[PDB]
Design a protein around this nucleic acid. Structure first.
Ligand SMILES: [Mg+2]
Ligand SMILES: [Mg+2]
Ligand SMILES: [Mg+2]
Ligand SMILES: [Mg+2]
Ligand SMILES: [Mg+2]
Ligand SMILES: [Mg+2]
Ligand SMILES: [Mg+2]
Ligand SMILES: [Mg+2]
Ligand SMILES: [Mg+2]
Ligand SMILES: [Zn+2]
Lengths: 102, 189, 68, 72, 165, 138, 142, 53
RNA sequence: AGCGGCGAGUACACGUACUUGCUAGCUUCUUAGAGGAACAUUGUGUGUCUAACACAAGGAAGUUUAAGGCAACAACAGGUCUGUGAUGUCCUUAGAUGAACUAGGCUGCACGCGUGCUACACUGAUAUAUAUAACGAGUAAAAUAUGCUUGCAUACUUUUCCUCCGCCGAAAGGCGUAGGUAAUCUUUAUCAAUAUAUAUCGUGAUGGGGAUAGAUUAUUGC
């Protein structure tokens, strides 16, 4: 019924494994599944100074926090997909289900 | 049927020095319609001698900080200078420029050599690549200094300098600097 | 420079000693043989080990090589 | 050594300028040096001559260089 | 249909080319020549008026001198018409960004500037009275009518036939 | 019938689509004559003059460009045109003639067929650029 | 092609009091008067119907009189209020545009008026220092 | 009356402070971190930031 | 995210450009996961013919292909207690060296030193016009509306961040109204300036330069 599954996470292994498991689990039920869509990766950056005080050569360090996102579509029921979603996922990935009928 | 600037042929031009024949490029790969090629010429030691001669001229023509990287303005300057050169003393302007390149560099020089602790200012010999480079540099500097705070435009100055350099006349910058270099070289050894 | 550290040379020398009858004078086949025999986590070091193996195999044709 | 270029054309000089059509390199600098006038005056006389087809274009001019020549 | 005169046609436009051309739309004519020629056309046929208050304004913050042509209003109008053909649903902010320059701030460094808005809005309203532009009901901004496109394209074809004969 | 080949420069990318036709060449919906820097037009016209007019009467080319600057867009357009003609001849005509044409273009110069790998260097703290450092005074 | 006679071209003028106005073009030659910049020279020249492409040495007397008239009382013409100096004058509450000489007197009077009241900015004019907030510890050092 | 803490403090350096120290200098306000720079350099790893180059 | 496919148009040449409703297939362009690819390979030279180096050909690439991050043993009486509910000792603790409220100073100017911005012009200044980037960011208080004499009770129903578009104003800006918690909107098949074209000026402290001063107008904020 045009259900969309959305995944976000900080870890690449985690979300890749979860996507693989959901993709294979839904295919045991003979369902029309749209392959994962990997959206652009977005990076959060902070550039702060070392040296609690102010003396010495001025050096910096560059920090990065990047976010991954996947996207799966399929035709099914709400109860089926909400059971399939929840098998005690590695709780470092966020999963949310939405109905895109329009 | 490839012409420089779509007007001038350099299919009949000759060098007639035989020392500088290998160091200036008007031949197979160097025949171009316009002096803009974004090549990699400085990666090796001697690859500089396959850049077409007019492109080396335009490469030295953008100098003194104010004009760094402004390549197209230099190309326009050089093209109009070549038109002015052809108009008076009607010849192939590239042949005149090659003749001027052949004349504007010294053939010998001086340097400090530490023979046995006591030294001198001994005369040495100049290589063909050094002579070509110095000719280009001195012609460009002469034209650039002529046009600063002057009524005459930069391309008029460049045309005059090239024509005078080809004719050995001691009214050009390159000829007189070169003669002074050679005089000191003959004096110190 | 392209000098090879002692880890690369020791691994190559043992490989030549133990599997001489299979090895050849071609880099790609020796790359595959080295993939199969040894244990090397990085493909870069594997390429360098296979290259030295091939270089050593070429020298043996000319006569004795010291240490093998 | 200060230049004393005139900014306009006289009756007496009027005949003198028009022999600027009877020579090879016609650039504003050459006219200014020859007749000791301004550069605006030299550009105006070049325009006057080329309007009446008394002077020939050597090439495609640009906003920064304007050489002409005498008529064949 | 057209008997008007075309502006000065410089060379470098008459070079032979190694492919084959067409000319049906303004995407086939040179832009500077079209702009000047159609500006003269608009001035001659009284299709727009020079706002009386423009005789003493400049066109932006960053300029600090006036246009010094006396025909700048019509020239900007014709550039705006061609721009409308290239970009359909355009507002006044787009046009302010479109005619930008650089502003020299004395002994402080330079920065990019932005054009004014009264000139632009008055020109657009003027062309709305003439029935060459309209305000997209569904969308936003404003675009060309059928009359405007037809007139612009007919002039472009006339210019092209004039040049290459 | 139809091929699609790209050309690249610093950050510009151009795509040329080649079909059978009657001689038309267009760039973003416009004729090639309207490429903007007039002094660099010969670079775009070069491969055509080399290959010639007779072999190219039956083709129609559309080109889109994106990114970069003046010069880099010109160079990407040249490379895309050359690679597109070579590809069309490789896919729909005997490829001995493909080899001949490729040799002509390669004899004139590479970068009519081979991309340029250069790329702007990252800057490091302590100076205005990648190499230059602030002025040290003692 | 203009052939203007050498005996009618006049080299030094006196347009307002204390002016010279040499052999220049009209726009730039009007900028020797002590309150005429480039913007207002252009506007004034347009309101007097005089061709900007001629030199000041070939302006007749009527054109000079017209220009001098426009420089005074420029609100009778169509010059808006935001082109003027002195837009409320503190003295008469009018928009005026001060010109040469007159301008120097106005500057002198402003300085002495704010120095008579013991205002901070006038007192810093009297001591010979910067008045608009500048640091003055490393620059301005004659 | 009372005049204790009556000056307006809706904006400016005197308004916000470190989430950990309570200091008022060199606060990170990007993404609403709201920690001064020293504590953040100490806690960045467990927060989620990494050093790659 | 694109391309393509099917229709209806607006104009031209006998297919091209643009607008528009709908939606066979494909991955070149966009995005992002897994892999592969260079080893000095081949030829020629130098070297104890070892360890290695140089040139040419091929190749996307042959200075370990380019740039960075990490950083041994041992030290400095190097800097920081003005980052810290990290801390030893000594001071001080109600006329406080605690915590606040009002005004002022940190910016004061005969002078000396370091990092810089703008220039000294024509390879320019001014004015019009054409063409063209990459990395980013973005939503407990005060504020808008009845009963009452500058205050109270009231929706946390709007608003507070980026702001398209329309109108007003020379301009700065003001008024009214969308979208967006974001590959969806601002806004990026493009959000800049060096560039390019045409005209004016013309070697004159000059239309170079823009410091120092006078007057009027807006916005942030008690
Ligand atoms: Mg502009
Ligand atoms: Mg730099
Ligand atoms: Mg100082
Ligand atoms: Mg792809
Ligand atoms: Mg502490
Ligand atoms: Mg206080
Ligand atoms: Mg301080
Ligand atoms: Mg001055
Ligand atoms: Mg100036
Ligand atoms: Zn803290």
């Amino acid at each position: 019924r045009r259900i969309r599954i959305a995944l976000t996470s900080k870890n690449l292994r985690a979300i890749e494994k979860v996507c693989s498991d959901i993709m294979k689990g839904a295919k045991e039920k003979n369902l029309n599944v749209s392959g994962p869509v990997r959206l652009p990766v977005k990076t959060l950056r902070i550039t702060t100074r070392k040296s609690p005080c102010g003396e010495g050569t001025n050096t910096w360090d560059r920090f990065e926090l990047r976010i991954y996102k996947r996207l799966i579509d399929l035709y099914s029921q709400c109860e089926v997909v909400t059971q399939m979603t929840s098998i005690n996922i590695d709780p470092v990935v966020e999963v949310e289900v939405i109905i895109t009928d329009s | 049927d490839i012409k420089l600037f779509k007007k001038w042929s350099y299919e009949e031009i000759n060098i007639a020095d035989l020392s500088l024949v290998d160091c200036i490029a008007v031949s197979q790969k160097a025949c171009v319609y316009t002096p803009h090629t974004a090549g990699r010429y400085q990666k090796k030691r001697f690859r500089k001698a396959l850049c077409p001669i007019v492109e080396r001229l335009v490469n030295s023509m953008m100098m003194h900080g104010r004009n760094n990287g402004k390549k197209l303005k230099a190309i326009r300057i050089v093209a109009y200078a070549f038109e002015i050169i052809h108009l008076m003393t009607g010849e192939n302007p590239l042949q005149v420029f090659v003749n001027a390149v052949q004349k504007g560099g010294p053939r010998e020089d001086s340097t400090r050599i530490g023979s046995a602790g006591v030294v001198r200012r001994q005369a040495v010999d100049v290589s063909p690549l050094r002579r070509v480079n110095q000719a280009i540099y001195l012609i460009c500097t002469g034209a650039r200094n002529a046009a600063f705070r002057n009524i005459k435009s930069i391309s008029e100055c460049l045309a005059e300098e090239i024509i005078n350099c080809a004719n050995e006349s001691s009214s050009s910058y390159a000829i007189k600097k070169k003669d002074e270099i050679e005089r000191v070289a003959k004096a110190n050894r | 420079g392209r000098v090879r550290t002692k880890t690369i040379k020791r691994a190559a020398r043992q490989i030549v000693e133990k599997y001489y009858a299979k090895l050849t004078l071609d880099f790609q086949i020796n790359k595959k043989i080295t993939e199969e025999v040894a244990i090397i986590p990085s493909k870069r070091m594997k390429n360098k080990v296979a290259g030295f193996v091939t270089h050593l195999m070429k020298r043996i044709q000319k006569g004795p090589v010291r240490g093998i | 050594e200060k230049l004393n270029h005139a900014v306009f054309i006289d009756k007496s000089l009027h005949s003198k300028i028009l022999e600027c059509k009877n020579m090879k390199v016609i650039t504003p600098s050459a006219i200014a040096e020859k007749y000791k006038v301004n550069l605006s005056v030299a550009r105006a006389v070049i325009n006057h001559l080329a309007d009446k087809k008394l002077i020939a274009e050597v090439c495609v001019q640009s906003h920064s260089q304007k050489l002409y020549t005498k008529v064949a | 249909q057209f008997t008007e005169d075309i502006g000065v046609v410089n060379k470098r436009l008459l070079e032979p080319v190694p492919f084959v051309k067409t000319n049906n739309c303004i995407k086939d004519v040179d832009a500077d020549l079209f702009i000047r020629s159609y500006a003269t056309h608009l001035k001659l046929h009284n299709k727009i008026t020079y706002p009386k208050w423009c005789t003493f304004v400049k066109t932006g913050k960053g300029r600090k001198l006036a246009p010094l042509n006396e025909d700048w209003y019509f020239i900007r109008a014709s550039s705006i018409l061609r721009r409308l053909y290239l970009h359909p649903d355009i507002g006044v902010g787009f046009l302010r960004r479109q005619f930008s320059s650089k502003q020299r701030r004395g002994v402080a460094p330079n920065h990019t500037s932005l054009a004014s808005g009264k000139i632009l809005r008055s020109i657009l309203q003027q062309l709305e009275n003439l029935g060459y532009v309209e305000q997209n009901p569904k969308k936003k901004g404003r675009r060309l009518t059928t009359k405007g496109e037809n007139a612009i394209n007919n002039f472009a074809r006339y210019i092209n036939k004039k040049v290459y004969n | 019938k139809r091929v699609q080949t790209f050309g690249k420069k610093k950050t510009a990318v151009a795509v040329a689509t080649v079909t059978n036709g009657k001689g038309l060449i267009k760039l973003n919906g416009k004729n090639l004559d309207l490429v903007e820097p007039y002094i660099l037009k010969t670079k775009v016209y070069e491969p055509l003059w080399l290959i010639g007019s007779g072999k190219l009467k039956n083709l129609d080319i559309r080109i889109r460009v994106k990114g970069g600057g003046q010069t880099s867009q010109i160079y990407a357009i040249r490379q895309a045109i050359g690679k597109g003609i070579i590809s069309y001849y490789q896919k729909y005509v005997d490829e001995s003639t493909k080899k001949e044409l490729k040799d002509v273009l390669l004899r004139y110069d590479r970068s009519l067929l081979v991309g340029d790998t250069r790329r702007c260097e990252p800057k490091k703290f302590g100076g205005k650029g990648a190499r230059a450092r602030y002025q040290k005074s003692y | 092609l203009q052939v203007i006679d050498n005996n009618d071209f006049q080299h030094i003028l006196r347009i307002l009091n204390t002016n010279v106005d040499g052999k220049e073009k009209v726009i730039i030659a009007l900028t020797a008067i002590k309150g005429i910049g480039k913007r207002m020279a252009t506007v004034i020249c347009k309101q007097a119907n005089v061709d900007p492409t001629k030199r000041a040495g070939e302006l007749t007397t009527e054109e000079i009189d017209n220009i001098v008239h426009i420089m005074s009382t420029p609100t009778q013409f169509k010059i808006p209020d935001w082109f003027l100096n002195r837009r409320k004058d503190l003295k008469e509450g009018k928009n005026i545009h001060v010109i040469a000489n007159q301008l120097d007197s106005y500057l002198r009077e402003d300085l002495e008026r704010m120095k008579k009241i013991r205002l901070h900015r006038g007192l810093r004019h009297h001591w010979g220092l910067r008045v608009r907030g500048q640091h003055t510890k490393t620059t301005g050092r004659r | 009356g009372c005049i204790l803490n009556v000056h307006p403090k809706k904006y400016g350096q005197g308004s916000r402070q470190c989430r950990v120290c309570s200091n008022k200098h060199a606060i990170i306000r990007k993404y609403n971190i709201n920690i001064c720079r020293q504590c953040f350099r100490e806690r960045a790893d467990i927060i989620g930031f990494k050093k790659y180059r």
